[PDB]
Structure 1
Amino acid sequence: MQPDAINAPVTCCYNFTNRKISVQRLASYRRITSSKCPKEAVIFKTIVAKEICADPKQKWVQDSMDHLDKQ
């Protein structure tokens, strides 16, 4: 499949944020799935360039995808 992602760094989330984030401040996102991680997650990159770990299961989270996907 991959060429040789074995040397690629692996990024995982260990806890999730508890405060919802404004759509006006989210710049991007990415899904965390590597089986090397304790669990699935979403990493939101903010307008002030901060990266936050969020629960895939939360509505605010999912709706934030919708808006970034241009809804």
Structure 2
Amino acid sequence: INAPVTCCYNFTNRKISVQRLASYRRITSSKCPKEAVIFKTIVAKEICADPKQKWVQDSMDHLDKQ
């Protein structure tokens, strides 16, 4: 209710090295234009990424393990 609302309005066009990534979360809220991934870098930078892209899915798999 008093939770913040986070959405992604664009998706990155570059592959982020698995070396630069710390975590991610998914956006699934219907308040947003679409479903998204937000990667967080080892410098705590937040980048919107397309959940349908293979590199994005691979990086989340990597982070789920490594």
The TM-score normalised by the length of structure 1 is 0.90
Residues 6-65 of structure 1 deviation map (CA, whole Å, 9 limit, x = unaligned): 110010000000000000110000000110000000000001111000000000000001
The structure with the largest helix share of the pair is 1
Aligned length: 66
The structure having more radius of gyration, on CA atoms, is 1
Runs of 4+ in 1 over 3 A off after TM superposition: none
CA distance in 1, matches of 2:11, 2:45: 14
Structure 1 runs not aligned, ≥5 long? 1-5
1:49 corresponds to which residue?
44
Does residue 10 (structure 1) correspond to residue 17 (structure 2)? The answer is: no
CA distance in 2, matches of 1:29, 1:49: 11
CA distance in 1, matches of 2:65, 2:4: 29
The structure with the largest strand share of the pair is 2
The TM-score normalised by the length of structure 2 is 0.96
- Report the alpha carbon displacement of residue 66 of structure 1 after superposing the two structures with TM: 0.6
Paired-residue identity, % = 100
